[PDB]
Each structure stands twice: as C-alpha cells, then as structure tokens.
Design a protein around this ligand. Structure first.
Ligand SMILES: [Zn+2]
Length: 456
C-alpha cells in the first residue's frame, strides 16, 4: 500500500481547469490515484522515488477509437491507396476469409490485441477504447473476452466497445451475411458483457460500451435498444459519424441526415461520443453542443482515405468536447497517437492559409489526446494530472540530441523528434514502462508469439 514519487520532472502539463503547468516538479502516487502534484513533495510514506529530471509528464494518452484486430492488416499493398468502398471491401473480405480458414479465432485476436496494446503503452497511451465489430459463429464468439484478457494481462486501462453490422444488403446494407447479426443477438451479448466485465466505479480498469458501426451499416432498432440499455446500465454509446458517403446513405435509407437519425433514435445525449465527424452540416454543429455529444478527431484515417479535414476548430468554438484517436491499423496503419497529433497539427493549416489563429495548437492537440478523450469516454477520473485523479501518467525524455534547441517542451513533443517512444508510463499507479521498455510484459516474446499467428 506504499506510494510512488516522480521527482523533478522538467515540465508537468496538468490539463486541469486552469491549464496549469509546473517546472522541476513532482507527482506523488498512492495506489490507483494521484495524491499531489507540485514542487518539492514529501517522500514520507514513499517506497520508491523515480528520477523525472529531463522529462516532460502528461496525463496518460487516451486512444478513444481503435480496432485492435486490424493490427494484422498493416501495410497491405492492395490497400495502400484505396477509397472507403474498396477499403471496406478489402478489410471485410480478409477478416471473413481468415475467419473461415480457421486463422482468425479469438486466440489470434488476443495476441494481435496484446501487440498493439503494448505498442500503445510504449507510445505513452494508458487507456484504449477498442471497437470490435466482428462476431461470426452463431454463438457470438469471445473476441471481446480476448481483447479484455490482453489488456488485463498488460495492465492498460480498457474500454470494450461491442460493435456490429446489423443492416444487411437484403435491407439496403453494404456488408454481407457472415457479419450481419440479428439485432437481438447483438443486444443479448452486450448485456452479458456488461454483467461480466464492467467496472463502473472510479478508477475502473475495464468498461463496456455499445457501438454500432454506423447509421449506414446498422438498424434503427439497435440504436434504440442500445439507448435503453445505456440508460438502464449506465454505460456509453459510440459510433462513426459523418464519413463522406454517410449523408447520402442515411437519406436514402431513412430520409434524414445521420444526426437527425441519431436524434430520433435516442443518441442525441451526453451519453455519446462520435468517431471522425468529418463533414457535418455546419448548421447541426450547435445542436451537437446542446446535446452534449463528444467527438473524437481521427486525423490519420481521414487523410488516408481522402476524406480531408474535420472542422475541429468549429467544434472547439461551439464548446463541443473533442478527443483523439488513431483508429485501427488497416487505416492508419500504426497505433501511434502522439505521432498522429503532428499530422493534425500540420495538415489543418492549409485550409485557413491567412488565419493562423484558427490552426490547432500543440497544447490543444495534447489536450484532445488526454482530457478530451477522457471526456469522450465519460471518465472524469482520467486525462488530468491533479490530486484525486487516476495515476495514469506518460513521460518523454527532452534531452535527446533530436530535441536540442527546443524552446517549449510541449510544442517540442509535437514538432520535433525521431521517436515518439515514451520513457516512463504509469497506469492505475503501476509503472508499466521504464527507459522506454516494458517492465512487466516480455517484449520479444510477445513479438514472436503474435507474429506467428498473423495470417498469411
Ligand atoms: Zn472506426
């Protein structure tokens, strides 16, 4: 029950309510939580002191949108340069194919998940929300059991978002039958997951969320069902939102915009975070704000697929919560959240060539990647370095030869570097990464084991 002191961090970014930062300052940790953050903290009941000099410390990064199983689908030549339709076909085909060859069972997803999750820790990411949409077998298989098992073995904080594709081509869908589950099978399964896995209490390490793939891909019955289940069991709701084709598909199936559809079917609530949000009607943005939905900025796939730049400034101006994420590795293709912030930092600028004040700043992006994401996930106990909050902490060295000359360390973190490898990472008060290495997980063994299971 003994504490941990991180002493003399060169810079500490808190993202508390004042955006306080401190210099040559400490973080005191006791079990799952932060006890204090400030200069010259007492080592009174401390059983280990960690030398933070030369480091910048942030709240642990929170990846608010992953698809772990896609770790197996990286850097496929056929999928290097493809639009959404071909990409979606390519991933679905591969996952369905590997699955009926017996090459993609929950045992495989578990080890893919273990690799990408460990990569995540090493990149300073302390919480991941994975959306798994793939459940063939008639009895919905243990894919989420498998990702939760990897997360738990690793000690990374975890949100399991049970996804689906419930709208088939026989109803106007762009999927297939092997992945199309009846709505009731999705709903039954979700209930069992909550009861078995959900840790609603503060500092909870595993939580469940309900996440249809999207309005073009799922039945309204599912959304309404989930809206009921979310209020009955106090869990959260997640889906994709305003991908370029969606407005057209939503109007064709239902005669309304994707937002108006969500509104109708119970999803205009503070009960919701929404992935991408690339091309909304501007007129709807103030409505996102009053509804209290949050939005996850996913720059890497938005660029990768040719979709472009989501109006993040507008969301910020409207007071909408904005978080950040990588998405799956079939459309990123890495799980490197920190690197992806540099992508956003730069790619937004050409869209407002003469109004640099509109450009997202390093600190606004770092906020998205911590506090913003914590809020997307409904976690007031994460995303902030201050007393009472979770001791989830990520730190990077500032004294490498590739960061010589850096005047502001936080900007430096986005704008410079050969490597996004974190030095020191703490989750739920447990040191998981030190000197850029895992201290509990066996790195080489995990690389070997997962590599052996990746399908040809
Ligand atoms: Zn996604």
């Amino acid at each position: 029950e003994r504490m941990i002191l991180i002493r003399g961090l060169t810079r500490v970014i808190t993202f508390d309510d004042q955006e306080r930062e401190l210099e040559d300052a400490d973080i005191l940790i006791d079990g799952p939580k932060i006890v204090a953050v400030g200069k010259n903290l007492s080592d009174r009941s401390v059983s280990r002191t960690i030398d933070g000099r030369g480091m910048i410390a942030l709240p642990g990064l929170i990846n608010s949108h992953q698809h772990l199983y896609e770790g197996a689908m990286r850097a496929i030549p056929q999928l290097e340069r493809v639009t959404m339709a071909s990409w979606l076909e390519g991933v679905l085909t591969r996952s369905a194919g590997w699955w009926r060859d017996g090459k993609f069972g929950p045992d495989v997803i578990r080890e893919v998940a273990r690799a990408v999750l460990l990569e995540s820790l090493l990149g300073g990411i302390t919480t991941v929300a994975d959306q798994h949409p793939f459940f063939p077998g008639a009895t919905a298989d243990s894919y989420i059991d498998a990702t939760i098992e990897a997360a738990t073995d690793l000690g990374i904080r975890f949100h399991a978002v049970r996804s689906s594709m419930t709208l088939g081509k026989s109803e106007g869908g762009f999927c297939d039958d092997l992945f199309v589950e009846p709505v009731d099978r999705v709903v039954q399964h979700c209930l069992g997951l909550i009861d078995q896995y959900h840790e609603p209490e503060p500092f909870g390490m595993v939580r469940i969320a309900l996440g249809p793939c999207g309005v073009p891909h799922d039945k309204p019955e599912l959304f309404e069902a989930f809206a009921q289940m979310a209020a009955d069991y106090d869990v959260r709701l997640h889906t994709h939102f305003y991908q370029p084709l969606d407005a057209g598909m939503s109007d064709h199936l239902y005669g309304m915009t994707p937002w108006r559809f969500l509104e109708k079917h119970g999803w205009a609530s503070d009960r919701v975070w929404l992935a991408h949000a690339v091309v909304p009607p501007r007129e709807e943005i103030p409505e996102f704000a009053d509804a209290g939905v949050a939005i996850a900025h996913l720059i890497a796939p938005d660029l990768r697929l040719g979709w472009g730049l989501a109006p993040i400034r507008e969301y910020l101006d409207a007071g909408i919560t904005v978080g950040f994420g990588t998405t799956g590795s079939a459309s990123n293709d890495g799980g490197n959240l920190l690197g992806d912030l540099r992508l956003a930092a730069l790619a937004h600028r050409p869209a407002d060539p003469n109004e640099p004040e509109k450009w997202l700043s390093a600190r606004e992006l770092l906020r998205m990647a911590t506090r913003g994401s914590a809020e997307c996930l409904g976690r007031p106990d994460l995303g902030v370095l201050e007393e009472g909050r979770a001791a989830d902490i990520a730190c990077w060295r500032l004294d490498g030869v590739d960061r010589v000359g850096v005047h502001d360390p936080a900007i430096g973190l986005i704008m410079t570097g050969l490597s996004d490898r974190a030095s020191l990472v703490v989750v739920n008060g447990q040191v998981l990464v030190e000197n850029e290495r895992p201290v509990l997980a066996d790195l080489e063994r995990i690389v070997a084991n997962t590599t052996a299971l990746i399908p040809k």
